[PDB]
Amino acid sequence: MAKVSVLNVAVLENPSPFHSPFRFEISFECSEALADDLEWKIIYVGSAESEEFDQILDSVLVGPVPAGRHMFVFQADAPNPSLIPETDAVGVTVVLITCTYHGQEFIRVGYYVNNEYLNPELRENPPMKPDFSQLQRNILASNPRVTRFHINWD
Amino acid sequence: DGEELIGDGMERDYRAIPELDAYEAEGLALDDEDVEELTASQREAAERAMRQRDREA
Amino acid sequence: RHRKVLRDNIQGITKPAIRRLARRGGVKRISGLIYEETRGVLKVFLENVIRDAVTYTEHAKRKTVTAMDVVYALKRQGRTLYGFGG
Amino acid sequence: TELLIRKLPFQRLVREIAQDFKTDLRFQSSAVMALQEASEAYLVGLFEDTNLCAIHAKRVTIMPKDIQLARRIRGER
């Protein structure tokens, strides 16, 4: 049974301009000290259609992990709009926070992200080519989806 | 542009149809055949082969 | 005149089931496109759980898939919750 | 009524899918019941996420994108 349990994720600076960084405050419990690193990563799903348009915004390492309750702040640069299909640029998608030990993902937190124009005319008539300077990214941080996977510690 | 799940006339969906609503014995195990559990050795040996299959996949 | 014998036509899953599940999930309206999409997800879900359970059965040296063989495969799937524990 | 997927079509479905992996399989009736309970739960789960995803694009009609997205929030690759 697992050595790490996420207590919380705080979505910070939300909503925000599409280009502003993602800011997360992650709190977790460690029941048994980890000698090696935990790898946390933030994933923007670019297109619902394919797993191929997913962007890894950043990745950080944490460790050794002593036992107890801990926090770190995970910030990452907003996704690169050149890689997002125009159809999917506006409207809903998903961002994911994930954690890995000895190569196996043991947890995946996910949030629905809405990319929306704050400009009433644009909302009415969006340009074929989406303008990302006009898009606000609202993360729904009231409905995280926490998904756990059994992994081998040691 | 789509379908309303409600649904005046949705009652059509909750109909009981016993022929479709129960299992048939064909392909099932009754009443005595090998149910023997997975032990320990075989369990880890199987979990082994799978962790490798999803590696190569 | 000219009577015809009925062949047995159960194959996969029809629309009423999809609506029943969608309704269980609070969905009040669906695209017609939802039906195909949903069968696909079910097939894919079942495929992965069945393949894992078959492999548990192959190792037990028997031709019957037991209930524990399924339970075990299901643990390989991962568990979604709507909040954080703690 | 609590009907979701009817027992027989589901059994037939499982049997067919299982046929690709191994030949001449039988199941315990409990095993089918479990796959059934599992499938039904997994799907109502996505549907729940589906309505939620659809409510935040501000639509009343769910679409295959919403389903696509819902499997991603759980990380089906």
DSSP sequence for chain A: --SEEEEEEEEES-SEETTSPEEEEEEEEESS-BSS-EEEEEEE-S-SS-GGG-EEEEEEEE-SB-SEEEEEEEEEPPP-GGGS-HHHHSEEEEEEEEEEETTEEEEEEEEEEEEEESSHHHHHS--SS--GGGEEEEE-TTS-EEEE------
So where are chain D's domains? 1-77
DSSP secondary structure letter of residue D75: T
User: Cα distance from D7 to chain C (closest Cα, Å)?
Assistant: 11
CATH no. of D1-77: 1.10.20.10
CB contact under 8 A, B10 and C19: yes
With 0-12 / 13-18 / 19 or more C-beta atoms within 10 angstroms meaning exposed / middle / buried, residue D65 is: buried
- Give the count of alpha carbons within 13 A of A86, CB side only: 6
* C9, amino acid identity: N
Are C38 and C18 in contact by the 8 Å Cβ rule? The answer is yes
The CATH number given to A1-154 is 2.60.40.1490
Q: Which residue has the tokens 């696909």?
A: C40
DSSP summary character for residue B33? S
CB contact under 8 A, C59 and B38: yes
Which sign does the torsion angle of CA B35, C59, B44, A148 carry?
negative
Is the bond leading into A64 cis (omega within 30 degrees of zero)?
yes
How far apart, in whole angstroms, are the C-alpha atoms of residue A94 and residue A44?
A: 6
Q: How far apart are the first and last CA of chain B?
A: 39
* Number of neighbours of residue A128 by Cβ within 10 angstroms: 5
Distance CA C68, CA C73 (A): 8
Q: How far apart are CA D12 and CA B16, in angstroms?
A: 19
Which residues does chain D have within 8 Å of residue A96's beta carbon, measured at their own beta carbons? 72-73, 75
- Contact between chains at B37 and C68 (C-beta distance less than 8 A): yes
- The two beta strands, A104-117 and A91-101, are antiparallel
Residue A66 CB contacts under 8 Å (≥ 6 apart), including other chains? A30, A33
The CATH number linked to C31 is 1.10.20.10
Pairing label, strands B3-4, C79-81: unpaired
How many domains would you assign to chain C? 1
